Amino acid sequence: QISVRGLAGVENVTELKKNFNRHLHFTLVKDRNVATPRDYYFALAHTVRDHLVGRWIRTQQHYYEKDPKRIYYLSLEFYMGRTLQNTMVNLALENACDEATYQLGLDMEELEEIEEDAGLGNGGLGRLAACFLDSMATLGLAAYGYGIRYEFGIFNQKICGGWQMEEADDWLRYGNPWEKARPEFTLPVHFYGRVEHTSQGAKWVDTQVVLAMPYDTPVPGYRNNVVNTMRLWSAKAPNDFNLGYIQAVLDRNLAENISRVLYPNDNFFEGKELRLKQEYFVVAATLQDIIRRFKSSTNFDAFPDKVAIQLNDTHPSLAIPELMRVLVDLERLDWDKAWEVTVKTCAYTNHTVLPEALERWPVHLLETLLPRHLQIIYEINQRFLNRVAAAFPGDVDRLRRMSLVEEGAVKRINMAHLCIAGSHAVNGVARIHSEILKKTIFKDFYELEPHKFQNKTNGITPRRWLVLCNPGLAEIIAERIGEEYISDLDQLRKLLSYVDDEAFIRDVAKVKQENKLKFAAYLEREYKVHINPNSLFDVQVKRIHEYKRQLLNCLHVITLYNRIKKEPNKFVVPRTVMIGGKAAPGYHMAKMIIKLITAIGDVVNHDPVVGDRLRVIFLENYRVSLAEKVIPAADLSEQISTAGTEASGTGNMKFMLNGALTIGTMDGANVEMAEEAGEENFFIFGMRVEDVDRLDQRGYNAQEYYDRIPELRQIIEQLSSGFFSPKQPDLFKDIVNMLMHHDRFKVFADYEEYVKCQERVSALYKNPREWTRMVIRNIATSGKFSSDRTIAQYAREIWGVEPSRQRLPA
Amino acid sequence: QISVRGLAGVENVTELKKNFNRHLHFTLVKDRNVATPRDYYFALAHTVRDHLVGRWIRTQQHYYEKDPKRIYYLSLEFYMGRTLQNTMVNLALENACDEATYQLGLDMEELEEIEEDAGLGNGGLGRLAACFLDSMATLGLAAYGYGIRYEFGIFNQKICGGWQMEEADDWLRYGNPWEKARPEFTLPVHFYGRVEHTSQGAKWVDTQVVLAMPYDTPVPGYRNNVVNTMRLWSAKAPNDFNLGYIQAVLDRNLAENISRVLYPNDNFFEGKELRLKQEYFVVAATLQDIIRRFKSSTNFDAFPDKVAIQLNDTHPSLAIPELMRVLVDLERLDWDKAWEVTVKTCAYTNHTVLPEALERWPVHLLETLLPRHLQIIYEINQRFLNRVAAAFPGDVDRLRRMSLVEEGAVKRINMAHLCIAGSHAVNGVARIHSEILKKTIFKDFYELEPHKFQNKTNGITPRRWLVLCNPGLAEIIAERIGEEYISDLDQLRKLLSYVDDEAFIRDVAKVKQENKLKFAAYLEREYKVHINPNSLFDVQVKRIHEYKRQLLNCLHVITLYNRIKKEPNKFVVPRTVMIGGKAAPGYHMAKMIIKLITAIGDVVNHDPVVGDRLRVIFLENYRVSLAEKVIPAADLSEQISTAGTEASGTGNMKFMLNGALTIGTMDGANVEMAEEAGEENFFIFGMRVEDVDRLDQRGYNAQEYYDRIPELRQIIEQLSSGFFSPKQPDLFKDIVNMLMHHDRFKVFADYEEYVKCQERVSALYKNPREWTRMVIRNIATSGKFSSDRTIAQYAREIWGVEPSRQRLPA
Numbered sequence A, B: 001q002i003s004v005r006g007l008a009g010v011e012n013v014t015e016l017k018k019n020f021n022r023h024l025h026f027t028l029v030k031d032r033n034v035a036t037p038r039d040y041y042f043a044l045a046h047t048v049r050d051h052l053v054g055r056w057i058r059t060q061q062h063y064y065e066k067d068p069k070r071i072y073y074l075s076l077e078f079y080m081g082r083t084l085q086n087t088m089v090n091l092a093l094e095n096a097c098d099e100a101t102y103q104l105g106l107d108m109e110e111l112e113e114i115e116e117d118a119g120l121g122n123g124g125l126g127r128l129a130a131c132f133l134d135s136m137a138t139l140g141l142a143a144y145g146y147g148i149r150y151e152f153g154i155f156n157q158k159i160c161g162g163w164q165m166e167e168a169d170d171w172l173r174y175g176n177p178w179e180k181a182r183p184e185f186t187l188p189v190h191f192y193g194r195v196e197h198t199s200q201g202a203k204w205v206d207t208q209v210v211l212a213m214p215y216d217t218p219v220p221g222y223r224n225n226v227v228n229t230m231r232l233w234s235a236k237a238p239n240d241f242n243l244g245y246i247q248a249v250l251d252r253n254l255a256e257n258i259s260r261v262l263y264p265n266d267n268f269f270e271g272k273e274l275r276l277k278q279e280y281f282v283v284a285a286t287l288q289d290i291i292r293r294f295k296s297s298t299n300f301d302a303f304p305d306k307v308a309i310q311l312n313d314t315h316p317s318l319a320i321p322e323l324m325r326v327l328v329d330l331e332r333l334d335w336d337k338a339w340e341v342t343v344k345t346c347a348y349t350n351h352t353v354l355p356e357a358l359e360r361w362p363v364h365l366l367e368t369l370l371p372r373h374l375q376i377i378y379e380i381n382q383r384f385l386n387r388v389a390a391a392f393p394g395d396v397d398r399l400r401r402m403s404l405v406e407e408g409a410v411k412r413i414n415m416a417h418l419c420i421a422g423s424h425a426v427n428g429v430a431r432i433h434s435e436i437l438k439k440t441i442f443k444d445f446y447e448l449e450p451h452k453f454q455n456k457t458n459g460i461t462p463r464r465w466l467v468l469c470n471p472g473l474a475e476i477i478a479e480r481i482g483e484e485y486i487s488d489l490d491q492l493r494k495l496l497s498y499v500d501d502e503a504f505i506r507d508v509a510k511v512k513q514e515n516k517l518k519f520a521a522y523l524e525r526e527y528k529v530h531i532n533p534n535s536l537f538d539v540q541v542k543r544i545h546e547y548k549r550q551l552l553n554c555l556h557v558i559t560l561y562n563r564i565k566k567e568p569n570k571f572v573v574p575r576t577v578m579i580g581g582k583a584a585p586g587y588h589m590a591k592m593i594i595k596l597i598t599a600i601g602d603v604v605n606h607d608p609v610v611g612d613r614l615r616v617i618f619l620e621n622y623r624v625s626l627a628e629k630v631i632p633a634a635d636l637s638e639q640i641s642t643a644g645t646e647a648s649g650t651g652n653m654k655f656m657l658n659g660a661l662t663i664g665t666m667d668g669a670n671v672e673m674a675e676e677a678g679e680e681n682f683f684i685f686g687m688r689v690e691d692v693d694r695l696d697q698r699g700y701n702a703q704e705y706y707d708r709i710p711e712l713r714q715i716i717e718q719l720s721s722g723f724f725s726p727k728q729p730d731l732f733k734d735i736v737n738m739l740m741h742h743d744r745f746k747v748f749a750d751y752e753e754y755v756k757c758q759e760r761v762s763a764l765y766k767n768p769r770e771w772t773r774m775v776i777r778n779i780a781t782s783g784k785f786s787s788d789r790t791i792a793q794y795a796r797e798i799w800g801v802e803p804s805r806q807r808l809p810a
């Protein structure tokens, strides 16, 4: 059909068809008379999977032969989404499979919709790991992703009566064709017990054992025949576990609960024991696997030359003391030598400055669950503080500020401090974020070891986020500059010479319209809701959180509604406001925000006077697969976090690459995006980080804005009086109270400039040609945000390895 | 290699090899450089499995087309054992696979030892179901086995310090290549709730729902291209289950625990709630599946003409009231019509007369868990008793004796009475057992409905129990009479004309010697224990239970030991006494018996004076795979249960078919075996059922035997004084006390005749030629004990269907 989707050769199509029929028969044990669409999806999945195996086996054999330095990316989250289309894209099998299935009388798109998302993540942090795996494979790095195979991923979100309802994500119900269980590589992990100090060294004894069984999933690079591995551990009880008889067998669940479910929190630390067990479980199994592979290549001096461990936030921070435990207690290295190896091996990536999101574990928890690790952490702290004391003699407050151990009600271990002390590199995820780290929360550390601090601006993979989800745009682009940009996104800059090209301007606008039509149809198909495809698609999709300020968006929507009701026969650019995202189960304010959004829609969407000029829709169950549908259809991307709170953001990059203009604050990567495209091509508004600090020093008083802005006052009175909740007048009292008395994110402070900026957006939308030319300027300068660029920087500046675009013999 | 193992054609061997390499690559994702023996086993299993699929699909399509009457065998146990070799045997692929693997540089026998036993049963009852499935497929019956897919089967038995230790049987750890999950056919099962009586009919509401997911396993008939299905249900929690959030997800285990583990009791009823849930779970899911298939063929009058439900004991007895519930409550049939259909559809098989083994559920349990079923059971009882009252006016005691409801401390439901009332056929499993049923426990029922009572003597499949485990014997037999006997065991009678054939006598004896050498080697391989292959192999393998009297065997062993110590230089036929079997975890006396056996061995096996003249070995972890090894190597089969307690026995039949002579009581099938071979060719001893009754009427006093038998007295004094337990003098006080004061099984009463009979056995063993001729007379008359004969009788006399030996086009 389209160029970028590969060739549909005569031989290959014939081959695909026979293997499809083979799997349907032998693998699924069905015939065309009883097979259902799901049966067909699996037949196709196994057929495509077969094409991965050969490359997968030789890639791993290749690394064994050449023995390059290995990169281990440790993360408690891998937000993978669907795998079928992505695999076809990277193997250049899309058109061939589309043709083969077509000839078999099947619609491949219909089959792709049957696959369950691998929702092993919460949002940005988990998606970043997924994009990174893709880029590492595309750049020929010998990388391995290590995590946990959660039986239940992020919950499926249902909206009932305008409220969020959660239901288990039983994603493995029908089986996972992509994974390969490797029970032969099962490893033991220890918990509890006590420490015994003998003649030579300490010993961790009387521990409870839980087995870690690995499941391997292939990670194909883009058309380079490289297939890396993502290894996820599953918890298994030993067979002598607890060994009345029946009860002993049933109690095995206690041990296996470790890999049962993903904690649904985003940017919020919950110090639960089960979460701590998950963190140590992944770290303990992974390190044994790493050391085993290292020895199968005694000389731990070369360990840092053959191994790089990247910590995705502090979740896997226990890798530092676990590595020390193994080297000191088991391998018998002297402390100093062990510490040198550990620091040169580990690197830490920070993703937030919000205090409530930082991991600070109570000492009594570590004391009971991991007694040996607590001792090692105290020793690390002692030696670290001696260094601080020697560098800043007499600065006693610095000593208490930098300590890994926090004193107070209950003593806690600051995992971020542990990571900085035990890593040779610490990085932020966007320039402004990395600078804030050095000026605020990690200032003392930066002054002690300035060389450790770096920046690695985030990125997204252009395979899934352009070619896969927006083939139409990928096609018209390839028509002008070729296909090389797919693995070298900087080439998009060549599109600048087409900004005045009437043919291109028309094609870009046509693709957007088609995407919007397709999405508008989807909304009626699976959700039954009518929308006007000619309206401006205003969307904000991301997890629900006060710092992301979905509430500011709500204030604007209500403002637009009140303005229409005031002057009904006045023309206004039609808009479809879409907001989607999940709220953590115990995050009350976040759940109230969801209810507010649906409540607004209930009023706005049924007001005769408004007509099709304004619609407010809440996108249910936002996840990777849904993102791939709504992002290509967006006109306006809402990135309005309070300046200084969104470390980077990545959804913002996905919208920019897909033809949507951005309205946002100078926060996270928004700053670099505007810098790349030019501020004139971005809709920037609101307080800058410096402005927020000035307001805090002075004291934020929301009452002042309420008193000076009539339109704002009206909205607050509508909320308090029950205008949006007739049957429950005080339903939103908590929201009004927070906004008026304890809003940490200054929603009112950016209200005026936001509304004004939104007016400028509507003004531009009225001029199709100029709107599209600005879009072209954005797409053309989005190259810097490819995760390929990000990974190349990690490789050269942190891991010490050179990326490669060389194909492997298939 | 050998004839009965099929042809090793040039084309097929080449084909097998390429498919083996294909699976190793694509399925297991490995190469010859990293593949382990387990990897090779799986490659072979998938290769053989492929040969089953084609036949499996067409067999099921065949039944759909011809729509014959369907046979549903409901059982909570299916003791399948290994599947690889059995599949090769039934498909005539053994020699081809042996050659193909040989050419690949692999030893197939070594690979077969890697497969885990599917130990979804406890013993005889579970093994009978497995043999039956095999015979039903071989006889072309449209049969389906329905049970539960236990995550953990019968526990693995370890012997530590002479004591039984139990460990979880994690048989699915490495995956099960034979099964095929069918999540698309998942069905809901209800529990708890309450009954609501509305205008039209009652309704079961407010129930808790548990999903039943089916897993299908193919059951190949012997070389007839028929492949039936064994469908096992697995418990799954609904996704809205219990829907803090984390806890709700973890609590899903509560619902899924239903299919977690097999209750390890044998001939003993344990009224636990979880067991009741398992029983209803299998019945509820199965009946919905049956009705669904029936409708896809409104006219329930023809239901009995298209469906037959066989209840393996009372475990699935809830099928009777569940069928009534569906027909009355859901289909809206009038009670009388529904009852007619139910009775004509159901048939019940009883397997014991021991009071402690009969299921008698407390009403309060049924009341809480299955309120609607309790009501239906009371109604059934009411109408049944009205019939009894009309047939035997004024006989009030008969009414209370026959009631389904037992009064007393706590009211209970007698499930056996429920089964008789709701079934058109009730059968025992051996002639003597079926007669005892009519004269004792079911006497009142027999007098009311004599036509319902039948006998169906048990049998074993000659495929697994001869061809598979003893190819050597199968071969020399085929050499003389051909291969037809494998599916027509009665033909073995032709071997009688060879009883005086010197060549045959020599071959039979040679095969036994080779089997014994192979087993003697195995004992040193996996268990490190030296034994003399020239000694008489005396073995008793079966679950440990007081009624089976392993204790009587122990008394004989000690007697032999004391006699040797008394006259050391006197010649005695060398013996290796082997006893094996598992004890239920909470069966104290059974665990003490195991300890006694190892204790005896500890003394006997290390006494210099005894030498290699006597050895006592306890066969650890007796299971199907071990039975296939030890039975072909046995010389003497111990079947010594107290007359009237072993309903039938099946191990006895396995020994007879494999060339071992039998020493036993006139109990169960032993009676018919001796009748077939001739009492002169059997070693019968002890009390007959009539003798046991006389002793009970008079009162059994063990003291009398102790006072009159010096050798017996000596043994009891050795046990009481600590001769077999130096460090723990009173260790066996419980055993001595039971034997002397409350032995329900009269061990002492059969001691004298047993020892005398054993002397006659030793006398015959000294004459190799005559021992072997008697063996030939046994093998030649074992034809009646083929489960093919048993199933043909069930088909014609109970299910109303004709068996067929017609091949299906492959």
Ligand SMILES: Cc1cn([C@@H]2O[C@H](CO)[C@@H](O)[C@H](O)[C@H]2O)c(=O)[nH]c1=O
Residues within 6 Å of the ligand: A265, A266, A267, A268, A584, A585, A586, A587, A588, A589
């Ligand atoms: C799961 C979760 C909870 N919370 C809040 O944490 C506060 C301090 O523990 C509580 O008082 C409040 O009720 C919670 O909704 C958040 O802010 N974000 C979150 O993701």
Ligand SMILES: Cc1cn([C@@H]2O[C@H](CO)[C@@H](O)[C@H](O)[C@H]2O)c(=O)[nH]c1=O
Residues within 6 Å of the ligand: A122, A123, A124, A125, A126, A128, A265, A266, A267, A268, A313, A351, A352, A357, A429, A458, A646, A647, A648, A649, A650, A668
């Ligand atoms: C601590 C934390 C950060 N992040 C996000 O990680 C993304 C990838 O680095 C950033 O772009 C985004 O700004 C962050 O808020 C999450 O999603 N969950 C989290 O718990």
Ligand SMILES: Cc1cn([C@@H]2O[C@H](CO)[C@@H](O)[C@H](O)[C@H]2O)c(=O)[nH]c1=O
Residues within 6 Å of the ligand: B265, B266, B267, B268, B584, B585, B586, B587, B588, B589
């Ligand atoms: C599991 C089990 C228990 N028991 C006995 O049941 C008796 C009555 O409940 C108990 O007093 C005794 O301690 C048990 O060992 C048996 O006989 N057979 C068995 O299979």
Ligand SMILES: Cc1cn([C@@H]2O[C@H](CO)[C@@H](O)[C@H](O)[C@H]2O)c(=O)[nH]c1=O
Residues within 6 Å of the ligand: B122, B123, B124, B125, B126, B128, B265, B266, B267, B268, B313, B351, B352, B357, B429, B458, B646, B647, B648, B649, B650, B668
């Ligand atoms: C009640 C019951 C019977 N049986 C056996 O079933 C076999 C097959 O019918 C018989 O040969 C044998 O005599 C019985 O004791 C068991 O194994 N477990 C049991 O719980």
Ligand SMILES: *Cc1c(COP(=O)(O)O)cnc(C)c1O
Residues within 6 Å of the ligand: A122, A123, A124, A127, A541, A542, A543, A622, A623, A624, A627, A648, A649, A650, A651, A652, A654
């Ligand atoms: C890209 C992505 C995110 C991150 O979006 P932000 O707006 O940066 O928070 C979260 N969820 C999904 C499903 C995503 O695809």
Ligand SMILES: *Cc1c(COP(=O)(O)O)cnc(C)c1O
Residues within 6 Å of the ligand: B122, B123, B124, B127, B541, B542, B543, B622, B623, B624, B627, B648, B649, B650, B651, B652, B654
């Ligand atoms: C045949 C068999 C049984 C039944 O043996 P009996 O002596 O009749 O009780 C029990 N266990 C296994 C493993 C068997 O193969």
